[PDB]
Every structure is written in C-alpha cells, then in structure tokens.
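Task: complex structure prediction.
Instruction: return structure tokens for all chains below.
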Amino acid sequence: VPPALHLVDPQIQLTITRADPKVYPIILRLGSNLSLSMARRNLDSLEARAFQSTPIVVQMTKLATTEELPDEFVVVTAK
Amino acid sequence: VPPALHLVDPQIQLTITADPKVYPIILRLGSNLSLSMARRNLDSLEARAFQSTPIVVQMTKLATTEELPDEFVVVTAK
Ligand SMILES: CCCCCCCCCC
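Output:
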C-alpha cells in the first residue's frame, strides 16, 4: 500500500532561505514513522540531561484528494 | 549500528506561529530520508499534476554536542 499523503498543519512548516522568503507546508510520504522533539541546553544544572528533549505533537492530516493541496509545498519522501 | 547526529543547515529549518520562530534541524536518521518540493501543473494536463523537484539537503554530521544551538528540533528518524 502506497504511503498515503499526510498534510502537516500550517502550524509547522519548513523554511528554506535566500533573500528571506519561503515557508512551505509539509507533506509526508511516511513509510517509516517519524518522531519529532524539541531540545534545549541544560544551563542550570550538571547532573540533569545535557539537553532537554520535549517530544513534539504533529497534528498532520491524512489526505484523500489532491485538490486539498496548495500549488507549492515540500514533500518529505519518508525514504 | 548508529544513529549519529546530523545538523541540517540554517538554509532549512522548522517553524512555529505569529511572532514565533524557527528551529534548525537534527536528524537521528534511521532510514535516510528524501525531501522534495512539489508544485501544481496548472498550465498542462499530460505531465504530472505536480512538479516534484527533489531538494538538496546540505546537512552536516556532528562530532561534538558542543556544535549545537541552544534550542532546536530533532527528527528521530525511525
Ligand atoms: C513527524 C514530523 C516530521 C517533520 C520533519 C521533517 C524534517 C525534514 C526531513 C527531510
């Protein structure tokens, strides 16, 4: 079965740069599933994790019709 | 068998809403991911509904954890 296309909400989008523009929503060709987390330096202790990992909630949407998409967007071929 | 940390350059970064910011990307790639830019084919009808142009990721492999930003997002690539 071909890895149905998933729309990652505008909440989260990519930013490619030159000049300054370019913010494309995200599409997933998820074969294997991807995990996303937020990390931050541990600058107030030295027995605590070097970095603080806070898993991130991806509210991506599964799609049925290609008409729901925008003219340009990035596609994470989950390869 | 791995995974090593890979820093995806500034060129490419994730983003969040309104005044909000961007975070560089780190990969715990299990599988080596592919990325591509797509576009609707609004001037034709015989060539792909969308323009898939594979995208070049200039990510860097990290040796030290000291090279990392204070904040950032990690894509644990299962
Ligand atoms: C689970 C959401 C993963 C989205 C991050 C995609 C980063 C680009 C890898 C090429």
